[PDB]
Amino acid sequence: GMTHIVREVDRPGSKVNKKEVVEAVTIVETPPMVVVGIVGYVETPRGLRT
Amino acid sequence: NEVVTREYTINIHKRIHGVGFKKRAPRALKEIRKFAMKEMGTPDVRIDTRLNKAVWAKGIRNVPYRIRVRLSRKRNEDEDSPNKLYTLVTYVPVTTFKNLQTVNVDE
């Protein structure tokens, strides 16, 4: 999903410095992954090869 | 167990949704016919005329939002078709749909 956020700003030389701003975001759910397997490649004059 | 009856309530507003003003109630009756066919595994269905009147009681645009019925299996007393069972649908009048469940009637 999506929502919005307030934060403070320390960009120097600007007209919005030392001030608050409002901006949108996206939220991304991320459980931990699991490893199962391996694969190794090799380099050849036609490209790569599994 | 194979001759049995029970009571239901149905939400029509979610089954007819997105349909135009000249097809709403007629599709209700099709949905009801689908409902039973999946509920009791029978491809033969009758409908009582009291129910039809209830649905067409406010025209064709405005169709009520919920309704209660009774289903019954039966076993072709005076019929010999390739089907051996048929279902039957009848109407129940009610003041309020609050808190109601799918009971099982016994007779």
């Binding site: 030389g13 007209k15 919005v16 001030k19 701003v21 | -």
Partner: protein
């Protein structure tokens, strides 16, 4: 030494805003803006802070039938500040100036927007209210 922070433009060419100062003008028919290169079949819009070139339609004979510069002070089209607030001012209004940015009258009616007072200081002095 700052910026301007792009806003939403509301006043295309062909509009008649009202004038605020005390010179005799009542209207200001816009004819062009400053600082537009353009694209095919697009109209040169204008917003607050933007400097434009204008004519008068109701006022004194001495000013009519001539071109002047102007600066915009209020618009009715909602625009965003970086604090997350959208704003509008009930009306569309301007004032007459010279090239360098020095204003021609002496007073201003109504409130001035913050977004032009920053750029043009001389306007900011003569204003009673602000924002």
């Amino acid at each position: 030494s700052g910026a301007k922070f792009r806003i939403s433009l509301g006043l295309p060419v062909g509009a008649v805003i009202n004038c605020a100062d005390n010179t005799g003008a009542k209207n200001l028919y816009i004819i062009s803006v400053k600082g537009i290169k353009g694209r095919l079949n697009r109209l040169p819009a204008a917003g607050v802070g933007d400097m434009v070139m204008a004519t008068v339609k109701k006022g004194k004979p001495e000013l009519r039938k001539k071109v002047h510069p102007a600066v915009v002070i209020r618009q009715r089209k909602s625009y965003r500040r970086k604090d997350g607030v959208f704003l509008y001012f009930e009306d569309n209004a301007g004032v007459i100036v010279n090239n360098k940015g020095e204003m021609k009258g002496s007073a201003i009616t109504g409130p001035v927007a913050k977004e032009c007072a920053d750029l043009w200081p001389r306007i900011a002095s003569n204003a009673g209210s602000i924002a």
